[PDB]
Design a protein around this ligand. Structure first.
Ligand SMILES: O=C(Nc1c[nH]nc1-c1nc2cc(CN3CCOCC3)ccc2[nH]1)NC1CC1
Lengths: 337, 20
């Protein structure tokens, strides 16, 4: 019609078929720890270090997420962790970090991720202070397309924030960390996410859907463009009071277009929140603030990035060797991993 | 300024997810 929208609906149809075959037949046990030279800690998550590694027989570099199995059980994250790996090995999209290999041993789960030399958007955002709107828009557009992709697969992402967005060598985004991703038709109830980014319906124990991802996009755009999030305080409890209060103030330098997009994304009323209406994602894609955005050009990476990572430069850590136990821990819990 | 209030706050580092 809608010649554009028809090309969208056909691409998504084929993508969903690729995803479904992998969703039903997950890749499993595709490597071993001794095939990877462990170089240094890139960062940390709840369940272990994320290591910079080199695959010995190819010389490729990856980020290897280690997950202590006992720590996953103790944090009651077994099902979320199985979701994470099953979803991540099945999706395929330019702005999604690829799960190149996964495996486990007696002690750990390992997820061998595509490596982004730029690291986390969070680091660059805090250092520079804030992104100008064209810079923020470039990143936002990639998130818009990625949520359109994921939501068509019945996937909710549930942990959007700058900490989880990596900058690649071309200056584009890769969404990392699928720890809370979930394939659900209809509503779900888990209280999970990051306080500053929680939609009101989550805080209110209301039952929710993909619209929490669109609210979270509003927080991210705001934080990228302002240098601070729209709702912050010293304690999460004070953050939640502001989120549900129905109130938000924009910096004096936000364009009126930006403020209008964010008022429709940061809408406490689900029935009025952009992304959740009759036109779905297109109330966002066709918004004023995105008028200069060439969505196809973004997808095929023809747009010049506003920022390319400085071509050594990592936060130092104390580095200890991986200890693999003599006995298998939590074998039945993670059987399908 | 709001920026100054943010920078002086305890939530300018990497933020942990909640797990309930
Ligand atoms: O999965 C993660 N990261 C990655 C997946 N694929 N690639 C990465 C990655 N993670 C990286 C982390 C850094 C550390 N820098 C410290 C200073 O500020 C910039 C980042 C640098 C490059 C990185 N590349 N989790 C983050 C480390 C805790």
């Amino acid at each position: 019609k809608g010649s554009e929208q028809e090309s969208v609906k056909e691409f998504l149809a084929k993508a969903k078929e690729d995803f479904l075959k992998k969703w039903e037949s997950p890749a499993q046990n595709t490597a071993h720890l001794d095939q990877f030279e462990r170089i240094r800690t890139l960062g940390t998550g709840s369940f272990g270090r994320v290591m910079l590694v080199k695959h010995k027989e190819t010389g490729n570099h990856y980020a290897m997420k280690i997950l202590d199995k006992q720590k996953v059980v103790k944090l009651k994250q077994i099902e979320h962790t199985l979701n994470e790996k099953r979803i991540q090995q099945a999706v395929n999209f330019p702005f999604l970090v690829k799960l190149e290999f996964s495996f486990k041993d007696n002690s750990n789960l390992y997820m061998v991720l595509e490596y982004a030399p730029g690291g986390e958007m969070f680091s660059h955002l805090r250092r520079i202070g804030r992104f100008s709107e064209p810079h923020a828009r470039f990143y936002a557009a990639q998130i818009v397309l990625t949520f359109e992709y994921l939501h068509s697969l019945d996937l909710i992402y549930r942990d959007l924030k700058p900490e989880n967005l990596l900058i690649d060598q071309q200056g584009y985004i890769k969404v990392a960390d699928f720890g809370f991703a979930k394939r659900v038709k209809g509503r779900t109830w888990t209280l999970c996410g990051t306080p500053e980014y929680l939609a009101p319906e989550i805080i209110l124990s209301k039952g929710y859907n993909k619209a929490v991802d669109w609210w979270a996009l509003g927080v991210l755009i705001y934080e990228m463009a302002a240098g601070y999030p729209p709702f912050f305080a010293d304690q999460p409890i004070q953050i939640y009071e502001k989120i549900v209060s129905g109130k938000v103030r924009f910096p004096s330098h936000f364009s009126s277009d930006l403020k209008d997009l964010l008022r429709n994304l940061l809408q406490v009323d689900l029935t009025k929140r952009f992304g959740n209406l009759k036109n779905g994602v297109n109330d966002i894609k066709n918004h004023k603030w995105f008028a200069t955005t060439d969505w196809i050009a973004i997808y095929q990476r023809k747009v010049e990035a506003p920022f390319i990572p400085k071509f050594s430069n990592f936060d130092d850590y104390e580095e200890e060797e991986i200890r693999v136990s003599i006995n298998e821990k939590c074998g039945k819990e993670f059987s399908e991993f | 300024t709001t920026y100054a209030d943010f920078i002086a706050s305890g939530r300018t580092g990497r933020r942990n997810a909640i797990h309930d």
